[PDB]
Amino acid sequence: EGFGPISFYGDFTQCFIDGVILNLSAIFMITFGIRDLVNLCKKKHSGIKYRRNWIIVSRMALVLLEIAFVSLASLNISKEEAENFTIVSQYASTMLSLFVALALHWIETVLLFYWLFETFGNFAKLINILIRHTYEGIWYSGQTGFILTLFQVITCASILLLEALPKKPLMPHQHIHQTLTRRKPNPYDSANIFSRITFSWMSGLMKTGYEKYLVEADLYKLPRNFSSEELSQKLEKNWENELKQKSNPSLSWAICRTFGSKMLLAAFFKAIHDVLAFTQPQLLRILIKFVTDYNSERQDDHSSPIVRGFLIAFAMFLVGFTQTSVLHQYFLNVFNTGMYIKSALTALIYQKSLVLSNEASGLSSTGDIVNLMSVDVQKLQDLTQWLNLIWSGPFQIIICLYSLYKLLGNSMWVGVIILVIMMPLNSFLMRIQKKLQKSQMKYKDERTRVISEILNNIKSLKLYAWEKPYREKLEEVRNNKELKNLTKLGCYMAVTSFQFNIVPFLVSCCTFAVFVYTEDRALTTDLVFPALTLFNLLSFPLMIIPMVLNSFIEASVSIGRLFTFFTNEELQPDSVQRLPKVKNIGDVAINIGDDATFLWQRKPEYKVALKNINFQAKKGNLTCIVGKVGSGKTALLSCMLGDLFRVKGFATVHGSVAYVSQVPWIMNGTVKENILFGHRYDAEFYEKTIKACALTIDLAILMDGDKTLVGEKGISLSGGQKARLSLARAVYARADTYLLDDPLAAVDEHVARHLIEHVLGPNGLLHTKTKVLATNKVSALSIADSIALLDNGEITQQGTYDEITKDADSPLWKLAISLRRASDATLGSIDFGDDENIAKREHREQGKVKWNIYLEYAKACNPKSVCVFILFIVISMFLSVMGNVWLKHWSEVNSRYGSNPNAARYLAIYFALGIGSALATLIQTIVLWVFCTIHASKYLHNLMTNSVLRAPMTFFETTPIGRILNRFSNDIYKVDALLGRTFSQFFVNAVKVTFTITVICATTWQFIFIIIPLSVFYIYYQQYYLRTSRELRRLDSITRSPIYSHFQETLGGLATVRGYSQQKRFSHINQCRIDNNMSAFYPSINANRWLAYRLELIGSIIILGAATLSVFRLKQGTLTAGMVGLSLSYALQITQTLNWIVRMTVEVETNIVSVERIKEYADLKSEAPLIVESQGDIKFNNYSTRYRPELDLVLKHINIHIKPNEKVGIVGRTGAGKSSLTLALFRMIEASEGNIVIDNIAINEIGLYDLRHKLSIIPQDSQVFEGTVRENIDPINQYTDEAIWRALELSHLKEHVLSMSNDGLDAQLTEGGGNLSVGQRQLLCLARAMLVPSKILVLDQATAAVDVETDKVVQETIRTAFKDRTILTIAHRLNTIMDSDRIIVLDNGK
């Protein structure tokens, strides 16, 4: 009688069954009875809380357990007749059941797992008794007690199912908990171990996503150990531990030590997966040996059992299931660790950036820090996926090669030489891949920069009508983009072909061709099929070895950047004391101590410092610091803000701070959100402020309500709008201490006169409280209650204007309530507002599943190319299957003829077959990429650019610039690469699945009945996952960008936010943002895990069906060992193929939806500007004119006539249709009721291009394009360089071209024109206008962006240069109003 784990029959013997049951019962009864009972009694004190319904299901489970224990006690008597170790198993099961009878009662996990092990043990014992009954008498072969052991088995199954499945209902008011119905709690908090591995909760979420499109409400709240606060504190404790033993690697040690446990668990699970994976080749080998030995046995019987095969099939199924469960648990743990890393690091970087020093901001550009927050944290999050894999790879390689050495033999390591010699080729190809990716990213960023540059001021581009050089340059860049993308496609296709071909075919065709005969031993079909499976498993380590090393190298750069960023210089707490509020009026509000001294230097003691200056401001006054550029005005103001390191002096600031910098700051949120800057609403005070500072016309001009979108991700706003918004925000922030740095600079001067009296002067709203307004305006100096002349960081004199006037006035003159404070907001919760705006566009369709869009893309490609691609894919798959089946035939021949190989002949045949399949895949991936794909990028981009270039001003003013900027740039890139990859992957995996199922059907006829239900299940899960993951990916893409945009904006307004002391609100907003992003990502990865689990379970069921049907065919009749080996070997490739193909399906769907969106952007039309059938010595006239958008009205009842050679000055009060006259004259809007006549010709009949080409505009703006000055002034090569030189000389800008442009007339320009002053840009626009030879000229806004000399120069230039050209000037200057021959008055509406 045997006693090992395997008997002569394949089943466990009785001894090993008792041993494993004893082990399971021992570990259960010790670990549950210690840990769970002690913890429950300690926490709950034997269950203080009696909350339980005591439903009948629990009593039924208890009674089932009791009757099972009774049956066990009854069967204990009979089995003890033999003298064996079964009494130990009986006693252990008795004690375990007796403990469980109380354990079930006490809880109202470990219990469930123990019941599963007990059920498996009873099932194994029953199978043993049935097998002995097959080998012996009918029923009572072993003993008569198996009939009640069946009752024990069914009782175990029933109690396991009835404990695992149903919930624990509670009677007394369970509904009271769910008060907050904004989001359901996640089911993950309430999920036992049986359901958690199966992810049934995600199946419920999948159903809810199937029946409804997901929104904020449908998603669940995150569970604990995911919010910002706990993760940030847990990282800060490890950061203090770094501060104990500070050094550069301390950041890495703190990060790893705070989350290393989950990575260790992931490592253990990966080890379990790796050791389990190679068992299946061994089971394949022993199955092949068993079937061929059984055929030999039957032949010997004819010359002179099935239980092994069935149990081997069951072993294969169990191996597949355990592999599935442990692998997906590993993936879940690793991605959870990455989520923790991202959530901690983003919050910590935000806090450190918020408390960062101003000098540190000066030493660190905004691009570097925002790129650090975007890429480096994402780099760590991505590297968390592959971090354990660097350890997993060598172990898998070592155990695979050990198994190969045991199987094949000694000194047969040609595969090792192929691996090690091919690895440097992989390294070189990965290097070229990285270089191509970096160059492509640089080119994409450059093209996006050019597009943003033109789109910032494309209104002026439309007016000048220089579109042809723009699109020509874009196509010129597109040529380089096309060739670089072609090179990337060629390299990627070569990499794909080498990865497909190099490992399996070449390594096999070397090793089993050579070393089988070189060792003098027949193949006999046991070697090559396990060898082929081993090579297929070993393919992944070859690519995995160099891949993770690149990101591992990048991790050093990322962690070094993070470490220097963290340990960069902070600022001291003691720069200034923000004391309590101001007392009753008279004492002090602000004080800088005696001989105070400050600087922008603490460590090295740079020269940037001021020394020995004091300051004092009385309560309720207006002060003004007056000084030139570099005077130390900004230094003194920032010192008052406390943003400096003091070296000497006493700084006390009373009350609260309100501050406006010279550069206005605007948040991404709406104008309502900006003006209501985290404060409770107050309607009358809001109306008072908006009346006093701004105007209601300033709200009306926005073409939207108060909830309009700010120009950062909305409609662009002019500088005066920004200044008025900043002043409105400041005055709405009712505060004690007030600070303004030239807010009137970026607005009209006569409107600045309205500003000073209404809000600042003694009638002003904030009259009785201290305010500093630093400006060099004479009206401000006259009205101000104190003046401080400052220069070079040292005050010269201070006092009242009375004190100034007494001595020589040279050095400045010749050169009972306190408004009840403000009131902050309550720090509320905030959703992601971007969802509804795109939901408006998505509302058109809800069943977008028809493939008309796919056939449209097919028409947009060459369909013959698609047919050739399909045929090439099928040819490659057929060649591979032919190679495998011919290998089966050759191995069967070698099995029949004992050691009589046609070795060279079949070596040549197999080499030809494999290299033919590899070349077919090569020609598929290389050439047809070039034909269909870049044709698509070229054509889709040409149509999109052609449509969007000719778009109307209604589209430009309505749609945001940023919205079409991101979609035009990003989505064109996604269709270029990702779509072309994913279509190929989808078709390859589809054809692979079809051929695998076809050969399996060829193995046995009756497989269609088993494959049909599994195919239905597969289609069901694919539909559910697609309709969920589409919306989840959309939400994830939505929530990513607002975090980085908010980081950029709060960095830009660092001074203003730190002055306003709203640091808590911004921190809470960042925490809410990352919480929303985590909520919009965790269901996505868990949905991926759920789908991959169920698909791999389907693959394991396919393995079981193939094996058991093969054994059934074996029992039914003759069966070849090679056919079974081939069928099982092809069956083993199912799981990875299905798990990839569904994901590629949803990716193709997402890419096609993006293609439809950008095509919808391309779905636009406008008027035809082309020539279809004109200056000087001609009259001009307008009659009955009307031209505005349909939703508004400005122009009506206008009849005017202008003779040639007359100058016109237009005058109008604010809002009286000023710019509409210019746009009507240019005929920018196609709507034209009436007739405008020039040269006795109606303007609308001809077109737009020639008319715009034959006029001159000064658009009130001076920002121009980047690039060469000659290209900017004269993009089309009109006439020479001497002409523009003369125009520049007449415009009097010789100084700039003399200073710069040393190489020639080719000086470069920074984009946006900020490198040079606005007056010089105005001179450049003047020079361009004078270069334009047209008589019609439009001039606008001469009285709001000039410094007197510019106005005189342009007035004399338009006077003397255009002696007779018709000039219409729209301005407020008295001189140009008087000098005009005919003053046209701009009526309010007609």
Numbering used by the authors: 17 to 124, 133 to 328, 341 to 851, 901 to 1258, 1268 to 1484
Sentences from the paper on this structure:
Yeast Cadmium Factor 1 (Ycf1) sequesters heavy metals and glutathione into the vacuole to counter cell stress. Ycf1 belongs to the ATP binding cassette C-subfamily (ABCC) of transporters, many of which are regulated by phosphorylation on intrinsically-disordered domains. In asymmetric ABC transporters, like Ycf1, only one of two NBDs (NBD2) is capable of efficient ATP hydrolysis. Biochemical data further show R-domain phosphorylation reorganizes the Ycf1 architecture and is required for maximal ATPase activity.
In this study, we have used cryo-EM to determine the 3.4 and 4.0 Å resolution structures of endogenously phosphorylated Saccharomyces cerevisiae Ycf1 in two inward-facing conformations: wide (IFwide) and narrow (IFnarrow). We designated the state in which the NBDs are further apart as IFwide and the state in which the NBDs are closer as IFnarrow. The R-domain encircles NBD1 in both IFwide and IFnarrow and is stabilized by extensive contacts along a basic groove of the NBD1 perimeter, intracellular loop 4, and the Lasso motif. The electrostatic interactions are supported by a substantial burying of hydrophobic surfaces at 3 sites (site 1: I621 - L802 - I902 - I904; site 2: F917 - I1123 - L1120; and site 3: L912 - I915 - I1154). These interactions are poised to provide a large thermodynamic driving force of R-domain binding and stabilize the R-domain/NBD1 interface, burying ~1550 Å2 and ~1283 Å2 of surface area along the entire R-domain in IFnarrow and IFwide, respectively (~546 Å2 (IFnarrow) and ~425 Å2 (IFwide) specifically between NBD1 and the R-domain). Instead, a rearrangement within the R-domain correlates with overall movements in the structure, including a change in angle between residues G913, G918, and G932 of the R-domain from 130° (IFwide) to ~137° (IFnarrow). In contrast to the interaction sites themselves, the major structural consequences of the IFwide to IFnarrow transition are induced at the ATP-binding sites. These sites not only move closer in IFnarrow but also rotate to occlude the non-functional ATP-binding site in NBD1. Notably, the second site in NBD2 (active) is open for ATP binding. Overall, these architectural changes resemble changes in substrate-bound and substrate-free states of the Ycf1 homolog MRP1. These movements support a model where R-domain phosphorylation helps stabilize NBD1 to recruit other domains into a conformation (IFnarrow) suitable for ATP binding and initiation of transport. The tighter assembly in IFnarrow compared to IFwide may reflect the end result of the transition initiated by R-domain phosphorylation that leave key components of the transport cycle (ie NBDs, X-loop, GRD motif) engaged.
